[PDB]
Design a protein around this ligand. Structure first.
Ligand SMILES: C=C(C)[C@H]1CN[C@H](C(=O)O)[C@H]1CC(=O)O
Ligand SMILES: C=C(C)[C@H]1CN[C@H](C(=O)O)[C@H]1CC(=O)O
Ligand SMILES: [Zn+2]
Ligand SMILES: [Zn+2]
Lengths: 258, 258
C-alpha cells in the first residue's frame, strides 16, 4: 500500500535537510531525487516512503555468492518497490531489474584542481606526475576495467597498480583529494557530480575535456512489477513538461556559489 | 524468419550507396542506422531485411481516424518487426510501441547561416526580422505546440501564424532555406542533424546555443514482442563496447568536410 522507495545519500540528489533530526519520514530529506520521487508518485498516484539503503551501495553482484547488493539488491529480493537515485543504466543491471528511460544524461569526466596542466584523458594517460583514480566500485571503475580502447586500457593498468591507492570510497573523498593534492591528483567521476562540485565553494575545481562516454540514470523497479510501465511514462511526461530540466537547474545552478 | 526492419532515408542514418541501382536488398543502403541494424542483428542472431517505410513518415496518430502512420504504424499493425531510424523517444510513441534505451542523445537546436546575429532561442523570440520554423510534423513541432515555457509559447505563436509558411517538409528543405535566405531564416532541428550539416560543404551553417531539450532516439519494436528484450540489451552492450560512439564518429566527423 505505502510503497517502499529505496534511495541513498548523495549530494544534491538526496541530502538531509538542515533540521532533519527534528523531522520525520520523507520530510527528513531533500534534493533532486526527492523532488523526482514526489513528482513521479503524483503521476502514478501512490503513497510512498523513502528508505536509505542499509549497505550504502548502488548495485553489483558478488562473483562468489551471486548476491546482488545495494539498491539493485533491494529490488531484486523484493524489499523495495522502486529505486530513485543516480543509478547508472548499465547492461548487467538491466538484465536483472527494469529501468525507466533516462531522467538524466551524462558521462564519465575529469575533475582537476584549477591550474592543473590537463585537458583530456590522453593528457592523463601519457604521464604519472599527476595521479588519477575512480571510485573503488561503481560504473566508472567498470568502464575502465572492461574497456578495449587503447587510452583507457593504459589508464586502467596504471590505476590498478598505482601505489598508494588512487581509488576512493566516496565522491566527497575523491573531491577532498583533488583539493588537497596541490594539482597532483585528478578524479574520474560522472559529469553530473563534477558539474555540481564546480559550483560549490571554494570554487577550486573544474571539469575538463569532453566526456568519455554517454549514458543515463534511470529509475529502477523489479522485473514484472505493475509499477514499471507507469513509472516509465511518468519519467517521459516529466521530461516532456520540462520538469527534469527545471529540477536540474534548481539543484545544480540556481544556488551555484561560483 | 527473415525479420522486417523498417527504416527511412535520412542522411547520414540511411542513404542510398553510390551504385545502389546496380545492387540488391540491404546492399542498397549505408549509414549509421544500417551499421546499427547490422550490429544489433549480429548480437540478437537474426537475419533481416531493411524496408524503407512506404509513406515516408516517422510516427503520429491521426486525431480523426486514430490510425498510426509511418514506422510506428508499421510496428503497431504488425507489418514490421523492428524500426531502426532517428526515431525520437516520446511519450505518445512509448504508449503504443517499445523503445530500447537510447542509442543516441540529443536535443532541439538552432541552425543559422554563418553571420546571423543570433546566439539563443531568446534572441529569436524577441524579433521578426529573422524568420524561423520547424519541420511541419515531428517531435520538434510537437515540443513547441505543447510547451508551457514562456519563450517557447511566443515562438510557437509566431511560427503558427507567420506568412508565408516557416515550416518545411524535410531536413534538406529547411537547410536549403537557411542557406538561401541570406541570414533571414533560422531552422529549429534536432542537434544530431544540425551537427552533421555543419560538417558538410559549403560549410556555411552553424549550430548556435545550447539545446532546448534533452532526449534520445530509440530502436522500436511492437508491444509484446520477443525481440524487445534482446534488442534493448543489444543497444546497451553496443553502447558499453564503444560501438555507438565509433559509428557516430564515422558518419558525422571522420568524413567531415569543414
Ligand atoms: C555515487 C556512486 C557510487 C555511483 C553514482 N552512479 C554510479 C553507479 O550507478 O554505479 C556511481 C558513480 C561512479 O561509478 O563513478
Ligand atoms: C527526420 C524527422 C522527420 C524526424 C527525425 N526525428 C524526429 C521524429 O522522430 O519525429 C523528426 C525531426 C523533428 O521533429 O525535428
Ligand atoms: Zn545532521
Ligand atoms: Zn540513385
Amino acid at each position: 500500500r505505502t510503497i517502499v522507495v529505496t534511495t541513498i545519500l548523495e549530494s544534491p540528489y538526496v541530502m538531509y535537510k538542515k533540521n532533519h533530526e527534528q523531522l520525520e519520514g520523507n520530510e527528513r530529506y531533500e534534493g533532486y531525487c526527492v523532488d523526482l520521487a514526489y513528482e513521479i508518485a503524483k503521476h502514478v498516484r501512490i503513497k510512498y516512503k523513502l528508505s536509505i539503503v542499509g549497505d550504502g551501495k548502488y548495485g553489483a553482484r558478488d562473483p562468489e555468492t551471486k548476491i546482488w547488493n545495494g539498491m539493485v539488491g533491494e529490488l531484486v529480493y523484493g524489499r523495495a518497490d522502486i529505486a530513485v537515485a543516480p543509478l547508472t543504466i548499465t547492461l548487467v543491471r538491466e538484465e536483472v531489474i527494469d529501468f525507466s528511460k533516462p531522467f538524466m544524461s551524462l558521462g564519465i569526466s575529469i575533475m582537476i584542481k584549477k591550474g592543473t596542466p590537463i585537458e583530456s584523458a590522453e593528457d592523463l594517460a601519457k604521464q604519472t606526475e599527476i595521479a588519477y583514480g575512480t571510485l573503488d566500485s561503481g560504473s566508472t571503475a567498470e568502464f575502465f576495467r572492461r574497456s578495449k580502447i587503447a587510452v583507457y586500457e593504459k589508464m586502467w593498468s596504471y590505476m590498478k597498480s598505482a601505489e598508494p591507492s588512487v581509488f576512493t570510497k566516496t565522491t566527497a573523498d575523491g573531491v577532498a583529494r583533488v583539493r588537497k593534492s596541490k594539482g597532483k591528483f585528478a578524479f574520474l567521476l560522472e559529469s553530473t557530480m563534477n558539474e555540481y562540485i564546480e559550483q560549490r565553494k571554494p570554487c577550486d575545481t573544474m571539469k575538463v575535456g569532453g566526456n568519455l562516454d554517454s549514458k543515463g540514470y534511470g529509475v529502477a523497479t523489479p522485473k514484472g512489477s505493475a509499477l514499471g510501465t507507469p513509472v516509465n511514462l511518468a519519467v517521459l511526461k516529466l521530461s516532456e513538461q520540462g520538469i527534469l530540466d527545471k529540477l536540474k537547474n534548481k539543484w545544480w545552478y540556481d544556488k551555484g556559489e561560483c
